[PDB]
Design a protein around this ligand. Structure first.
Ligand SMILES: COC(=O)[C@H](Cc1cccc(C(=N)N)c1)NC(=O)CNS(=O)(=O)c1ccc(C)cc1
Ligand SMILES: [Ca+2]
Length: 223
């Protein structure tokens, strides 16, 4: 997260860290046994870490649970990042409490101009590298498709939306992938991609979760 602020320990209870010996992506707890993340974060031997703030210090509220199954969207295209969403099932159900809680799926798509909360342990510099140990937060509005279908160099399908600032300076970044974008109290997006970080006229692109609710519900009901 570039240009954000320190969230504060466990203030984003649904945020998860995907660990394969080190933190490599974020995710969101949607219920006691399922996590939603980005398909491009797929990897074998994933351990889900809940109740995290400082990912390098055991603080007492963590829950480490291995993944038993990973399901990448059936139409994921790794070249265009279309349908960049994946479901991860935990080997055992997490214990939900004040510091570990699920985030609700949307019933309608968020409107342009709506302010959202993006969080993650990703790079905090637009130029160079510096990874934080504690969770960072960013307030960012959803931009009109017009505002980036002309700003984005790659293809922006109807399964993505842009959020951020055209002036640059504030944006999600490497290591934030798979993380949540929450607007109106529901999970509206997944950190997917962008051109560099916090670059002018290059806002972040996010997976539009509202278009995947049917698939998510059907999958979790049968797995
Ligand atoms: C990979 O290194 C990076 O600095 C960022 C990471 C990132 C991830 C998720 C969201 C954002 C964001 N800005 N909101 C940034 N991505 C890039 O810079 C990728 N752009 S790219 O133009 O470098 C590119 C595009 C396609 C391929 C195969 C490889 C590289
Ligand atoms: Ca910790």
């Amino acid at each position: 997260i570039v240009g954000g602020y320190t969230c504060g320990a466990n203030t984003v209870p649904y945020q998860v860290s995907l660990n394969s010996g080190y933190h490599f992506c974020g995710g969101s707890l949607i219920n006691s046994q399922w996590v939603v993340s980005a398909a491009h974060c797929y990897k074998s031997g994933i351990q889900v870490r809940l109740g995290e703030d400082n990912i390098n210090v055991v603080e007492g509220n963590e829950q480490f649970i291995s993944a038993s199954k990973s399901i990448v969207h059936p139409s994921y295209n790794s070249n265009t990042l279309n349908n960049d969403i994946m479901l991860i099932k935990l080997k055992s159900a997490a214990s939900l409490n004040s510091r570990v809680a699920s985030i609700s799926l949307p019933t309608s798509c968020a409107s342009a101009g709506t302010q959202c909360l993006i969080s993650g342990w990703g790079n905090t510099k637009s130029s160079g590298t510096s990874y934080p140990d504690v969770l960072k937060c960013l307030k960012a509005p959803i931009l009109s498709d017009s505002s980036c279908k002309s700003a984005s160099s790659r293809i922006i399908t109807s399964n993505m939306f842009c959020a951020g600032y055209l002036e640059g300076g504030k944006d999600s970044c490497q290591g934030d992938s798979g993380g949540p974008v929450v607007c109106s109290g529901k999970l509206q997006g997944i950190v997917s991609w962008g051109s560099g970080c916090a670059q002018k006229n290059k806002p972040g692109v996010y997976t539009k979760v509202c278009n995947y609710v049917s698939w998510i519900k059907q999958t979790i009901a049968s797995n």
